[PDB]
Amino acid sequence: KWKYNIIYNMEIEVLTGLHIGGDSPVITTKYLINNVEPCDLPYIPGSSIKGKIRSLLENVDYKGKNGDDIVSKMFGYLTRLIIRDAFLDDGHIKSAEDARNVIEIKSEPRFIERVRRGTKFKGKIILSIYEGDNEEEMIKCLKTGISLLEDSYLGGNGTRGYGSVKITLGEPIKKGIDKYE
Template identity: 40%
Template sequence: MTSLVKKIKISSVIILKTGLHIGGTNSSLNIGGPDKFVVRNPLTNIPYIPGSSLKGKMRSLLELNEGTIHMDKGNFGPTKDTTTKAGALFGTIGDQQQPSRIIVRDAELISDLEEFNNTDLPYTESKTEVAIDRITARSNPRTFERVPAGARFRMEMILNVFDTDDEAKLVSSLKQALKLLEDDYLGGHGSRGYGQIGIEKLSFEERDRTYYAKN
């Protein structure tokens, strides 16, 4: 039977190099406000980066880099091959089911909140863009809410290593996915400059069975 050998806690800081937009729910009518809002903690109203956004982006980038994106009836989807880097790290579905080895936490904002005193929205900025119809030349202005460049978030992940796993391959794949993410973007509208990030203070802390046996 497969057994858990250790957990590796991965910690780092995400710093925004450009404004970040990860969409949330437009829960209220704000006349004159942004058309697209960012996701926020409903209790504190502070923006955060969902773990699902981080995990999904890292997986897709690793699959693109490997060339292992699965195609089924003309539709693209996650790889179903457990021998690929993405499959081994992020898990698979289908005939070869394997649970994800990586847990990605929501990343909370750790910047001093006083840094946002000059933003036009609470902890965020509004950015207006204009789409131009190429046929009629009619303009269509729209406003996006973004977490501004310079904001910092605490990122935490847990890597589960089982006795059947290649630990070195899992760690290497995770580091590769993080490097790819730095040279890509997080959230929406990356081709227009949004979502460039840097990853700092990356650390790995191993916790084996003896760690969890202690009272």
């Protein structure tokens, strides 16, 4: 039986140049910049965050308060955790030329695209809570997974120093059946 969803308005700040692949470009999608101009701009796929956090917890052998596989129960072997695609906070992005200033071309002698340090992504995380679930343990498993990621990296070329990320969850919003009406 379902209790409520916990909603997190997550923010992802790029600390070192971030490369999530699609010369190798980063994955992009169409934005309407300044509510006028169509522009292809980076986004962070939810699969990248969820897959990276999951692999990090499996590397540290994260188990629940007992021996339970909370990692499997949350991230999947009924859905308990969605991490959606995150899109650019277009807060200081007012023209298509301001847009892909966001992207740096970095040589390594191929040329790799990266999302420059300081760009911010906004995305939702939805946690579904059912009766019999340990909400505090699930949040904790999510939090320390985020902690693991910040001492690691998103995307590729992390050995080269790419993809250091600061993840900020807001305060949790609990929505029960009442709030959906």
